[model samples]
Target: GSRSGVAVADESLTAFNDLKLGKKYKFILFGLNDAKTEIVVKETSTDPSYDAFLEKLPENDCLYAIYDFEYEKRSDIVFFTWSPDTAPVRSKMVYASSKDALRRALNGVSTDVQGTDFSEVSYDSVLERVSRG
Candidate 1:
């Protein structure tokens, strides 16, 4: 039968109750080039809340998780800086149809550098990855 079916999947319902409130998780920031090819990076976390929020997104859109680092230097007391560089990763997925869906497929993929585990990556390393592709 050629019956019609319509469904609007609201992504803001994924359960995140197990997520640690204060802890943070790193993510690989990606953007499209002029040709629409993806450029990936090992970036730092802007805030844990963002990940928590995204995890709750509807299953229709894909969610990729990358573990970097969440750090705060206690030695630095001065909060004023003229040149501050920190940006959050933002990605958008354009689907061919409304029913297109993405599942948890990023598992087992290592976002860290070659021959190195996620625990080995430092702040500078993450930034470098982001600065490059």
Candidate 2:
């Protein structure tokens, strides 16, 4: 089996349910634990502001994000693979390697976006992706 061997924490599931099932959060950020053995819920937003979500994306790190995007008349949720260009190689490596562990763990994502630069993850860029999707 091809896998990253990085397990998704139980807390990640609970947090995901709160968003996907309950619609209680605008977005959720997922990250790795200190030991780098598991993926965990790093942050969540209730503000429903795009800035609120993007603000949590550090300029020099790699992580994952699930954003509840309202595009036109759709309630589309986006999965973001955030490996900022400024992030060091290993930080990007581990997250990219473990990406699917979290992707499959969260089953309701409507679209997936890979971002190495902020421009790629901008609201308009995401909007266009979803529109095309």
Candidate 3:
């Protein structure tokens, strides 16, 4: 099912522990009213490319969370903005119900040239490829 609305809370940490879904999973939380979505990327993948991407993130002390949605098989793209606080920001959650929609959303985020765009490559793609060293 498609998600639409505001994120009243971020239960990433708790969800992560409860699901026990490995550390390499990407947890996305959709928000309403153009509120910023939360993405918690776990650090469990041994894939070098994945590790490299994580290493590029600005070092901060904020604890992150992961929330998995049981949507359909279609791809979903999410753009991330680094924040020290878990509170929402001013942005809309990028939801893609199809591959085309995914590409469109990916292109939009990649070209923004603002906050780090996690859309440059699919989260799963990054995990599958070898890191360039």
Candidate 4:
């Protein structure tokens, strides 16, 4: 079976808005040439190795966050903390209440907080967080 949702093509796709709190959606990305990105959205069920980790999280949170589909090298990862009380539990519906809306407000403050332009830049913000834990 397949699911449907709005395609995000603008600057709205921040790290925080990449995935939802409790929804099962196959997130796909396309390269500039219109090729399918190798992005994967694996749930905790399919990958048992992540079982111990998922067991500690709420039933609503997905195991893996959304990621790019194609990249010659592994992209830098930056983790953000979330509060259960403030997390937006997925609603029972076809799509979010609004199209391309900022889904998770608690995510990193702004694009400045975590730069998204992964161009020639080394993505130091991601490396900094990884070094911490």
Scored by lDDT, the top model is 2
What's the TM-score of every candidate structure? 0.22, 0.92, 0.22, 0.19
What is candidate 4's TM-score against the reference? 0.19
Candidate 2 lDDT over residue span 1-133, tens digit each: 2354889999988988888878899888999887888999998888867877777899999889888888677788899999988999988988988888889878868888998888899999999988884
Model 1 stretches astray by more than 4 angstroms: 1-25, 31-34, 40-44, 49-53, 56-58, 69-133
Task: Give candidates' CA RMSD values in order.
Answer: 15.7, 2.1, 15.8, 16.1
Question: What is residue 98's positional error in candidate 2, in angstroms?
Answer: 0.8
Give candidate 2's whole-model lDDT.
0.86
Write down the TM-score for model 2: 0.92
lDDT of 4 by residue, 1-133 (tens): 0243233334324322443332222221211112212112223222312224224433332211332211234332223221233233542122223212223422432222222222211334434444444
RMSD over all Cα atoms, model 1: 15.7
Off by over 4 Å in 3: 1-10, 21-27, 30-119, 128-133
lDDT of all predictions: 0.27, 0.86, 0.31, 0.28
Better of 1 and 4 by lDDT: 4
Q: Write the per-residue lDDT of candidate 1 for residues 97-128, one digit (tens) a residue.
A: 21122112222322333212222233455445
Candidates 2 and 3 compared: the better one by lDDT is 2
Going through the candidates in the order shown, the clash numbers are 2, 0, 2, 2
Runs of candidate 4 with Cα error greater than 4 angstroms are 1-3, 7-113, 116-121
